[PDB]
Amino acid sequence: FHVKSGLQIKKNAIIDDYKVKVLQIFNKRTQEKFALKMLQDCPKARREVELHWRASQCPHIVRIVDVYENLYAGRKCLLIVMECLDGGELFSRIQDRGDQAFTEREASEIMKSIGEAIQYLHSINIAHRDVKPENLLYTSKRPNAILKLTDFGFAKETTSHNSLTTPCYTPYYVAPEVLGPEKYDKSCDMWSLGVIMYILLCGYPPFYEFPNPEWSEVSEEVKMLIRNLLKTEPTQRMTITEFMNHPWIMQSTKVPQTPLHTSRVLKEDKERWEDVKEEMTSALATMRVDYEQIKIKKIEDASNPLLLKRRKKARAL
């Protein structure tokens, strides 16, 4: 493509370029409007930032403006500067209209906005791994405003792999394989997405099971098998090329404008929505396999209170 300049973390004081949970600050020479996320400076906070930085290209991804390596207080803090998106939280906007019917094509004009980003990140071998409400945002508040996303706290490097499997098993049932990874990793995004189209449609949760099918459900059977291929299991899981190679998404904006009841059901009750918000964060954290945990020593080398006792009596005998 076109070689772009690398990221250089400005070492100088952030307080000299801008004028005194993401916080707002006002630059001096431009007085811009300007979101700032802070952290405890270290390689994970730098590795992630390097990724987020190199992820500003895509118009679908929020743009980081400046990364400073400073010393707040006693500790060194990697203070990033990004493009603010005051559009508002995705589920925050919809939740709070009104009459207007979130129509199917609108939900489609959304997935593509997100399916485009994934296609970008994944194409550069970057696994976001964290897709939840608090991380999705629009840019302005008025019309013709696009939505680009945030919070790469859990993104990482995936590695270059590829995807089939079918039909049917054999006589050695089952066995083991490469545990992250260049595939499984990606399948933690699509889950977040498909698990979004559902919370987008019935505003209900796969906690999957579709609505009764009567009831705000027409979506098509083409709309059931889709949220299903996205849904369960991360091997033949729904493929960001295959997903984008879908008329419903590919030829979106032509799809029916079926009116929905999603916005009324979720807004009807906005406390289970917070409860639902946790389980989504809990669900994800439970399917994310990234930060090494231990490497259990061979039982022969392992030594602990229980083992000792068992071994002791094992010798008295």
Partner 1 sequence: ERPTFYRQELNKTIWEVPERYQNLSPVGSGAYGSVCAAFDTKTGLRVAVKKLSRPFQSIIHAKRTYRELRLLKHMKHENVIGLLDVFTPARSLEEFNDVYLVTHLMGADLNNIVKCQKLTDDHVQFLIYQILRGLKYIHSADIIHRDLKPSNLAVNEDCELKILDFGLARTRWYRAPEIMLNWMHYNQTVDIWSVGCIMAELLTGRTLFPGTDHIDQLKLILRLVGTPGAELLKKISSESARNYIQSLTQMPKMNFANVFIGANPLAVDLLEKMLVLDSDKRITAAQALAHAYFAQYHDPDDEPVADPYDQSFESRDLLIDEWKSLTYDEVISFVPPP
The first and second tokens of residue 126, run together, are 């970057």
Catalytic residue among 66, 130, 151, 185: 130
Interface region with partner 1, contact rule CB under 8 A, candidates 8-16, 211-219, 247-255, 300-308: 300-308
Residue 21 assigned ligand-binding role: yes
310 binds partner 1 (CB under 8 A): yes
Taking the C-alpha atoms of residue 201 and residue 223, their distance in angstroms, rounded to an integer, is 10
4 binds partner 1 (CB under 8 A): no
297 binds partner 1 (CB under 8 A): yes
Name which of 281, 283, 243 is nearest 133 in CA terms: 281
286 binds partner 1 (CB under 8 A): yes
- Residue 53: other Cβ atoms inside 10 A: 22
Taking the C-alpha atoms of residue 9 and residue 12, their distance in angstroms, rounded to an integer, is 9
Question: Which residues, numbered 33-62, are part of the site for partner 1 (CB under 8 A)?
Answer: 40
Q: What SS3 state is found at 312?
A: helix
Residue 83 assigned ligand-binding role: yes
Q: Residues 46, 119, 208, 220: which binds partner 1 (CB under 8 A)?
A: 208
Q: Residues 5, 144, 160, 282: which binds partner 1 (CB under 8 A)?
A: 282
CB distance 146 to 197 below 8 Å: no
Cα-based distances in Å from 112 to 41, 42, 214: 34, 34, 27
CB distance 254 to 194 below 8 Å: no
CB of 95 to partner 1, least distance (A): 17
Q: Residues 54, 180, 217, 264: which binds partner 1 (CB under 8 A)?
A: 180
Interface region with partner 1, contact rule CB under 8 A, candidates 61-69, 213-221, 245-253, 272-280: 272-280
Residue carrying the six token digits 């295959």: 242
Any catalytic annotation for residue 275?
no
- Give the torsion sign (CA, 54, 58, 60, 63): positive
- Residue 181: other Cβ atoms inside 10 A: 16
Residue 78 assigned ligand-binding role: no
The first and second tokens of residue 110, run together, are 């959304």
Could you list the residues known to form a binding site, using ranges. Answer: 21-22, 37, 83-85
Which residues of this chain interact with partner 1, rule CB under 8 A? 21, 40, 171-177, 179-180, 208-209, 228, 231-233, 274-275, 277-279, 281-283, 285-286, 289, 291-300, 302-307, 309-310, 313-314
- Positions annotated as catalytic residues are 130
Could you list the residues known to form a binding site for ATP, using ranges. Answer: 21-22, 37
